[PDB]
């Protein structure tokens, strides 16, 4: 009964969240190599900055 009522309550507010999360996740997911290279370069530069 708890699962039934929870799904009943939070259903109309679900499709918007799914669409928003899908769009924001696809913003980064179609740039995987760029993000990983950016993180590697940032690691190098930030290690240089932090050590000094």
């Amino acid at each position: 009964n708890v699962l039934s009522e929870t799904v009943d309550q939070t259903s109309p507010h679900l499709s918007a969240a799914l669409d928003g999360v899908a769009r924001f996740s696809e913003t980064i997911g179609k740039r995987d190599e760029d993000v990983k290279k950016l993180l590697a370069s940032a690691n190098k530069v930030a290690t240089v900055l932090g050590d000094r």
């Binding site: 708890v2 699962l3 918007a16 969240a17 999360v21 769009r23 924001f24 913003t27 980064i28």
Partner: protein, 49 residues
């Protein structure tokens, strides 16, 4: 074999303890994350650049 009493009882009590009256909280989470992620996704070109 999957209808073992111990697992079913633990799952049931845990689901009760977790989702007891959390419809409003979950609705708020969904609305807030929808708005935030839509705002962030409207800047797809900006984030790419």
């Amino acid at each position: 074999r999957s209808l073992e009493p111990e697992k079913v009882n633990t799952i049931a009590t845990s689901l009760i303890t977790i989702f007891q009256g959390q419809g409003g909280t979950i609705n708020d989470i969904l609305d807030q994350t929808a708005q935030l992620t839509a705002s962030l996704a409207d800047r797809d070109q900006a984030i790419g650049e």
